[PDB]
């Protein structure tokens, strides 16, 4: 069986694009991330998502944004997509001024806390480091 | 009732514990590959199958190029985390 994708709206696609960070994070400017953000905007436009691009949000702005989106009425929407483009650690995404737990963000959308998305696919696409291990690969 | 954690999909660019790679001109390897596979297959394939092709493209077609030997010739595999309870098609019918 398949999710019902024929509601009047495919849904929102929120793209959070963090390029420049406070020096305290020690992250260097994420060159190339604007290309990703525009590629994503176009790709999801073509899938008939209502794309909202946000650039350079602090961690407080990320949470406030995700809380606000979770309190909208998604009744006429089939799905929800959030793309995070940032620095990260395992389980963590960076605002421009520091880390916030990914669970904090995704908990706004739990089945009991966002009832107009209950039973609907909630997609989190995350371009961010998850630690500092390096994969040297294996010849094939 | 359904579990409150059901119907989430986390499409991570890299495996737990690892760095994720980004080309300074072309963008991150994962999003480059994700947009390309959506463009090609969203009209046809179920989303997990699209993400498996993204896994393959990232795994096989990219390797890092760095002036720092420590970071040179490295590889990446994305990580699909699915709590979905149904197949996802971006078209209808």
């Amino acid at each position: 069986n398949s999710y019902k994708m024929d509601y009047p709206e495919m849904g929102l696609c929120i793209i959070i694009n963090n390029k420049n960070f406070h020096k305290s994070t020690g992250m260097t400017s994420r060159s190339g991330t604007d290309v990703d953000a525009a590629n994503l905007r176009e790709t999801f436009r073509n899938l008939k998502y209502e794309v909202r691009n946000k650039n350079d949000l602090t961690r407080e702005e990320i949470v406030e944004l995700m809380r606000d989106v979770s309190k909208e009425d998604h009744s006429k929407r089939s799905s929800f997509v959030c793309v995070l483009l940032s620095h990260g650690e395992e389980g963590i995404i960076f605002g421009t001024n520091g880390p916030v737990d990914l669970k904090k963000i995704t908990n706004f959308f739990r089945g009991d806390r966002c009832r107009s998305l209950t039973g609907k696919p909630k997609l989190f696409i995350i371009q961010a480091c998850r630690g500092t291990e390096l994969d040297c690969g294996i010849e094939t | 009732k359904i579990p409150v954690e059901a119907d989430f999909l986390y499409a991570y660019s890299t495996a737990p514990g690892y760095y994720s790679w980004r080309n300074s001109k072309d963008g991150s390897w994962f999003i480059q590959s994700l947009c390309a596979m959506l463009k090609q297959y969203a009209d046809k394939l179920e989303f997990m199958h699209i993400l498996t092709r993204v896994n393959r493209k990232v795994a096989t077609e990219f390797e890092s190029f760095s002036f720092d030997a420590t970071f040179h010739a490295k590889k990446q595999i994305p990580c699909i985390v699915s709590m979905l309870t149904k197949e996802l098609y971006f078209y209808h019918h």
């Binding site: - | 760095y19 980004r22 300074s24 970071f71």
Partner: peptide, 5 residues
């Protein structure tokens, strides 16, 4: 060049 995230 490639950079990490």
């Amino acid at each position: 060049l490639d950079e990490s995230d």
